[PDB]
Amino acid sequence: MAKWVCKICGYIYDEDAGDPDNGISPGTKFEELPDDWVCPICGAPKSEFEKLED
Ligand SMILES: [Fe+3]
């Protein structure tokens, strides 16, 4: 699945990993993260992530 970078801090939101410590099961697409989900490292909103693909 896809990987996304937090443009602020470099954390990778890896769809295959999810973010279980913050309520997101492995395999959750970035689109499906709640609107108010934030980078678990720096607190940046979803807007600040970029999809790692051409
Ligand atoms: Fe971040």
UniProtKB/Swiss-Prot annotation:
GO biological process, one term: alkane catabolic process
GO MF entries: electron transfer activity; iron ion binding
All copies of domain Rubredoxin-like, residue ranges: 2-52
Keywords carried by this UniProt record: Electron transport, Iron, Metal-binding, Transport
Superkingdom: Archaea
Co-factor binding comment: Binds 1 Fe(3+) ion per subunit.
Residue positions binding Fe cation: C6, C9, C39, C42
Matches recorded under PROSITE patterns: RUBREDOXIN, RUBREDOXIN_LIKE
InterPro entries, alphabetized: Rubredoxin, Rubredoxin-like_dom, Rubredoxin_dom, Rubredoxin_ET, Rubredoxin_Fe_BS
Temperature section of the record: Extremely thermostable, being unaffected after incubation for 24 hours at 95 degrees Celsius.
Cofactor: Fe(3+)
Record carries keyword Mitochondrion: no
Record-linked PANTHER family: RUBREDOXIN, RUBREDOXIN-1-RELATED
Summary of the function given for this chain in its UniProt record: Rubredoxin is a small nonheme, iron protein lacking acid-labile sulfide. Its single Fe, chelated to 4 Cys, functions as an electron acceptor and may also stabilize the conformation of the molecule.
Similarity field: Belongs to the rubredoxin family.
Annotated protein name in UniProt: Rubredoxin
Native species: Pyrococcus furiosus (strain ATCC 43587 / DSM 3638 / JCM 8422 / Vc1)
Gene (UniProt): rub
